[PDB]
Fold Glyceraldehyde-3-phosphate dehydrogenase.
Amino acid sequence: MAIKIGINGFGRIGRLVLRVALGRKDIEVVAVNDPFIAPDYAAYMFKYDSTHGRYKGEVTASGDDLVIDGHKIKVFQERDPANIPWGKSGVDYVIESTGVFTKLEGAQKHIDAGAKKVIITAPSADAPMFVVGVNEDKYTPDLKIISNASCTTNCLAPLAKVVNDTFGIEEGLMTTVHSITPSHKDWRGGRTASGNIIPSSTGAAKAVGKVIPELNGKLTGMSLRVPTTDVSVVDLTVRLKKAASYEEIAQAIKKASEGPLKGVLGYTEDAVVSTDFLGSSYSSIFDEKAGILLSPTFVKLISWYDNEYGYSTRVVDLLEHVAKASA
Amino acid sequence: MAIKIGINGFGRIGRLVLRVALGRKDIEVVAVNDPFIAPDYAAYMFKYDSTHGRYKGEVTASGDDLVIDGHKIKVFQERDPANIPWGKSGVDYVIESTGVFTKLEGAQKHIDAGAKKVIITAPSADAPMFVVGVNEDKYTPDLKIISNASCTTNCLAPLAKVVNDTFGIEEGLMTTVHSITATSHKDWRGGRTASGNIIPSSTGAAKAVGKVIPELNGKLTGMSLRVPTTDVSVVDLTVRLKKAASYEEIAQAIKKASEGPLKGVLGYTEDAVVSTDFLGSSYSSIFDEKAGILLSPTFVKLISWYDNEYGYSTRVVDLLEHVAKASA
Amino acid sequence: MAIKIGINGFGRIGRLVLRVALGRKDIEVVAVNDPFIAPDYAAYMFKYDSTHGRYKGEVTASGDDLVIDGHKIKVFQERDPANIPWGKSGVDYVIESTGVFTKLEGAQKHIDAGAKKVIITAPSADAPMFVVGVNEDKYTPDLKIISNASCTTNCLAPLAKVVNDTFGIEEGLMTTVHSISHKDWRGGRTASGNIIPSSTGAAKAVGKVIPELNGKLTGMSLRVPTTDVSVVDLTVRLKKAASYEEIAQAIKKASEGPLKGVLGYTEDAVVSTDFLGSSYSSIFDEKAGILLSPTFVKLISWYDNEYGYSTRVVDLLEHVAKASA
Amino acid sequence: MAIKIGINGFGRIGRLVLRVALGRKDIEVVAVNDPFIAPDYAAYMFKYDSTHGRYKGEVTASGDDLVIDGHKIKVFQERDPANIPWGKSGVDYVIESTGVFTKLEGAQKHIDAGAKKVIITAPSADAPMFVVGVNEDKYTPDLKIISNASCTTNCLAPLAKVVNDTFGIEEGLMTTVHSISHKDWRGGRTASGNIIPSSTGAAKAVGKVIPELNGKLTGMSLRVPTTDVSVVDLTVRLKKAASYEEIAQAIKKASEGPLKGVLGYTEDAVVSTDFLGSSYSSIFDEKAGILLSPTFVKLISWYDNEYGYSTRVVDLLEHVAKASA
């Protein structure tokens, strides 16, 4: 065997990872660390704000433990990760879902405190990134601290993985219309999101060059925040090396959707809207009808994704691959 | 001495055109035709349904007329454009904002009803299209029915002009994020709830630019992403250039044209702006300089804002005055 | 044994009833009728707009059938309800969900076409109205054409019953905030970014479902741009004095007894989306209510628009069949 | 004659009161205090003033000052309100628009820094409370720290005054539809796509500005995903019997004389965004209110959140600083 894991931080990603981890039989959530929230408040946010609607099952809160469908889960309140008793409770893998310890120096504190491997759920500035379905086969057991990139990257990287392997991506620009999911001169972010299209920035397109090195330096992108929530979409516009018709691009994306990228890269040919993909375990759903082709080497591809939901499943997928590779 | 005009249809487009024509001294409105609405219902839609703030002015509805700041507007409920008396009212120009008679077969019903030239405020595969700032100079007086394209086309064409005139447009894939505008199985996605939903849809705006810019014919196609917002939309143009350049050369070319040939039509800004920052703007296209990306010296993505039909409606009044000046 | 039903109109309510009916074994949906949509279009709206998000099941369409998880359902396209082959299809009950044949004369056309009884999923101006949990026991088998009231009425009537039964309602004003050329000029305004005050006879219709409250209950509506989750705000003057604890404790007792599955009771810091896909007809919000005097209180109750209402339609359908035979 | 003021905090309320302050001819803004923001960042937020449109004036940021229409306004970044050079800058009145220094022990630091009087733009548990048009004439110059309550209170108090003066309010329950140790858990939820019930406490605040209604009004709030304008739903029990026409006529006559400017009256089919930018404190919706009994009515009134409130702050400032009004 049972993979004894632990989760630092109990936010949107931390709660979504816990729900998926509780559904896996070979994974045992031993403890959770969050110094800000109380055990009863953690049960409230997991009851109503884990998945859409509310969780279906008994969720209680003991004096210092979360009881979710009988599974007693210890809760710690340590603001410094080096004080979390990962060793005493027997936690091997720590899912870093705080967004503040996203570098090797910070994530190492979990390893110093009794843990072995640390998987952070955010783009890192020094830890090797890994995207399930794209470069998880490149993982080797010597990597103690890795990363699973962000929301958009887990949607763009599989789509770009298929188009690059079949036709070759010469260069590509991306615009991701992002849902609600002043830190460094970000004046546009301080504006109210309600009733506002806010052009922001993301490093997802460049981070793709890190999970598939062939595309390094070949992709840039920006974001357009919209007042809606739940589901975001990726608008990839690339120049191809090999000419093609749209029918050949969609059938290549579909061929991988049913084979190697099963469960990660979805495919559809229906008149779908954003709310059709809420609660989807997919990381990227290609919209065949939405895409348009202007020349046999210049096409625009569109892919949906439900923010942190399908992403949080890939964290659990990556956790099992890293634990399996250490056998 | 005054352009005696008239508006067929009192919708969101027609009410904004009536609002701009009053400010212009050379344009006088005398009649408004709308079958399904009443004069008192029209005074309510002009005062309040103008989704900005509120029309700061007295808006009264007489027995059969519309009083706005002391100006009488004869309201007609003719369901057929072949029965609205344009000649008895002396309205030489007709603004077709119904969106139903967007062809020469229907627009001619305004001509043989006493009026001279009628301009349709919607794309027309039957009538020649025109965009103020691009192909507006190629207007000829013998042409009696012209089209002012759509609000999206009036945003892409001014931008795609200065980019093609300076660097030359090779290809161009467009994405227009559109907010709530205005309205049978030709659009399944359209029959979905707009609230809390991202709805992709097609648009012929990029293909329409190929008509107002004959060089770009066949090099610009696009699609739309409807979002639940209100009066503000944006254009995400990804173009391959014919000549290598830097981003500051592209921004300086747009900034230069915004200060000269496209003054008032094409806007330029370098501020960290959001959508609501352009509420009620008279520009039809406003370039966002800080938002653009240059991946390679021939591969760029440009961003331009536009306030839906408001910047489009004031453009109809500009093209209308051009027809009067061209009537030699 | 297994009741054979049919659905008129394939809109939001007709789709939600078909979904709940498929989940129950005692009901067998034989056919649907909608003269405006094609079979492939009815399958599209059922796949991506019946269940919130996406339906968990295969939804295809053949020539004149709507195959949903293997079960074939005939599809008619009759504008006149009297031309619908209900008799030869074996359908005994018709679910009138179009919203235009909501009177006795109009709904009769289903009976003229071979059906036995019709249930209108809308308030009716002449057909008898019944709400599950309030006056469902007042139904007699001789009633052929009944109404299931509104979705708002199905939220106010359960709450108003327990408050009137335990403490008695002297008077009561309510206000429901409803989530997403004409006679009313506010309805023509854009719903995006607007709180539009509208109106409904939901409170006056409570008098038809509990005759005591007839004439001493009225309210209005405030439309909000939210998505398919509304909440009723009821302000009543009580006849018997009480504390807020005693009002909430009684609502809880009925939620765990006679009104189980219909009236819900919560004490948590819940929000709109917490009742997404909720099977209840109304959920009392204990923390939201406030008491001013011992006989003057304000109560809050949520409901997921037409979801719990459609489950209630299926509930009323099985009760009528329970009483018809 | 001329008064010199300063604004502590540069949030939405602080930015709105600054705009109305520049419009008047008597008040001259001297300096603004904000430790988190910068002078260059302050010009960016004031030029794009949230949901009110772009400012029609040259708003540039100089070296250490902020320039609007040529007027140079100093900017201080002192985190402590006692270390702000209000006296060295010649500031007399401090507009506490922060929300943290609402008590007397906190607001009096501005007095120790060189100012003479402080007006808090938030309901205070220690400072006396005033609402223009309701109890502004009861201000005595010996009061150096006062508050103008909340923007919700400025919508109910002028309405409750007119109803109570003519018909008398026995009891009143309120519900306001709001737009935009853990205490409130609902507040920590996503505002978009959610109706979030909250507690405003504005009705009990009317007991301070109207001592007669003390203990007769309590309310709650419903936060909806919108902006611009909010609404107030008042359900009062009257003392004297009256019809809805008598109530509407009493409000209309009040809004044309003693409350000309603060209270508004409309009979049109209005919506939310129709009051975007209204300087009124309350707009009675005559076409929306209903009457169940001659002494049991439900009144609805609109208010444009912080806009009219901020205008009402400058009215209180000139009323306090000058005896002419």
